[PDB]
Design a protein around this ligand. Structure first.
Ligand SMILES: Cc1cc(C)c(/C=C2\C(=O)Nc3ccc(N)cc32)[nH]1
Ligand SMILES: Cc1cc(C)c(/C=C2\C(=O)Nc3ccc(N)cc32)[nH]1
Lengths: 290, 290
């Protein structure tokens, strides 16, 4: 089938790293098919000595779907390069289990980073605007590469040295250089509360559904890692969404910031901002703060 | 899409239980889309007082796929009744999150039960044959109902009062009254090492792939909850399987028992035993022990 082909094609040098030069450590978390461990790599792509890295692999009892996801992620990260997208350094596929060797972000996930925080780790509204803008810049680059990410959320943004945002989890990203949409027949594996109305109902993903998700991520940013649609079960979302409802303005959120969220959630995808406008809007908010 | 229809159809009495008569407790485990909590139910279907039950629900950030899985499970368990299949008592779908109220098996999962054990909790080879036979009886009943289970494994068999086996996790089960196979286009979510060669390669599921899985479960039973194909990565399974290899005879395993395993793993599905023969074979082993 499609996977046996992918596994054989794959299994037969710029990305290949010797397993014996990688040392694995503690688990950092479980993703959308994968496990991420802290690791250290010896003589990694021209860096003399050990470099602290993160390693993505399969959990116990991995399914065909998870393995395809991991191979898919690996194939997207090869093509992708941007200071606000997680960096890929290699893979180990010859001696044992498939391991992806990626950039380590010192502060962990954005959700976790925000939930350890307060308002004024003491974070300003400028810091929160800054985070959202970096992410938006990363998204505009991916949108320019013709890639829908599909799984945009605070748990999938990492915080690197100097509080730099890194977009991660590319297991679910799709190529759209051709039809400008990715249409999935079976049911998706992206959390219900982060999905655009057309993705939920019609299984259509586009850069415009990434914008929807981004608007949900914005809400997470502004609430310091709050839980979207709190106390509302996912099954209620079909009806709540189609009848026009949206999360209300959260506390500690300017009128203009809430306007940007709502705009990302417009029912008609063509009336949502593109990432270039989002970056423009957030820039404009940053400079008027003073 | 297919799910919004299912969620609306569903959301609009023999199975409906009042939420206020259910009290939730500790988590028991995370399944193949779901969370299972221990619970207690007041005046549950004619039992006066509280009955200790188990409750299946969605985890945090549930996806469309998981929700469909939960609704699917609920729809299969309504039709299903057998002393060795987990019993469904109701659902709560009107006040909050979807909850399935199911039979509580006091000893937990079969894997966990076996891994706490030794050979002679001291278990004989008769006890292990007994477990496998009860499971096989459950499978023959489901096979007669025209249901492929797809996810047969020790972690999905529960151990109830009196060490009774209960087949669980019906999230992935399919109806095959019509074409006698279930064919999935996208990649499955069943662990690679429990899947028949045709399911892995050609995405075909039949009662004959359940037999394959059962043979893997047999190995788990005989090894007291060992890990299949130990130290072999899932990606190696395409090639290992198609070139004719199988797990070797484990220790503490008769010649005849190993013969039954191999037979479940025959490449050609029509040369595998049906569950009736498996039950016949295990019965025959039980009585010759003495
Ligand atoms: C200190 C730390 C905590 C965490 C959750 C991380 C996570 C990651 C990390 O540091 N690099 C990563 C690359 C991909 C994914 N999916 C996760 C990570 N690092
Ligand atoms: C004491 C105990 C431990 C465990 C893992 C259980 C698990 C279940 C249990 O007791 N009933 C269940 C029904 C369905 C599923 N998927 C799991 C269970 N019970």
């Amino acid at each position: 089938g499609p996977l046996s082909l992918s596994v054989d094609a794959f299994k037969i040098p710029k990305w290949e790293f010797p397993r014996k030069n990688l040392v694995l450590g503690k688990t950092l978390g479980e993703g959308e098919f994968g496990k991420v461990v802290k690791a250290t790599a010896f003589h990694l792509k021209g860096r003399a000595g050990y470099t602290t890295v993160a390693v993505k692999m399969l959990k116990e009892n991995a399914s065909p779907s998870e393995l395809r996801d991991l191979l898919s992620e690996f194939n997207v990260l090869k093509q992708v390069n941007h200071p606000h997208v997680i960096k890929l350094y290699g893979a180990c596929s010859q001696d044992g289990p498939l391991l992806l060797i990626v950039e380590y972000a010192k502060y962990g996930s954005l959700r976790g980073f925000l939930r350890e925080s307060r308002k004024v780790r003491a974070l300003t509204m400028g810091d929160l605007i800054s985070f959202a803008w970096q992410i938006s810049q990363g998204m505009q680059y991916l949108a320019e590469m013709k890639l829908v990410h599909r799984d945009l959320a605070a748990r999938n943004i990492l915080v690197a040295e100097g509080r730099k945002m890194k977009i991660s989890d590319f297991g679910l990203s799709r190529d759209v250089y051709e039809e400008d949409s990715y249409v999935k027949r079976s049911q998706g594996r992206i959390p219900v509360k982060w999905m655009a109305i057309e993705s939920l109902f019609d299984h259509i993903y586009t850069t415009q559904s990434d914008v929807w998700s981004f608007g949900v991520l914005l809400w997470e940013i502004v609430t310091l890692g709050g839980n979207p649609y709190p106390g509302i079960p996912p099954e209620r979302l079909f009806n709540l969404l189609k009848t026009g409802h949206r999360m209300e303005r959260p506390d500690n959120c300017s009128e203009e910031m809430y306007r940007l969220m709502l705009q990302c959630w417009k029912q008609e995808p063509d009336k949502r901002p593109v990432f270039a406008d989002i970056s423009k809007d957030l820039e404009k908010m940053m400079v008027k703060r003073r």
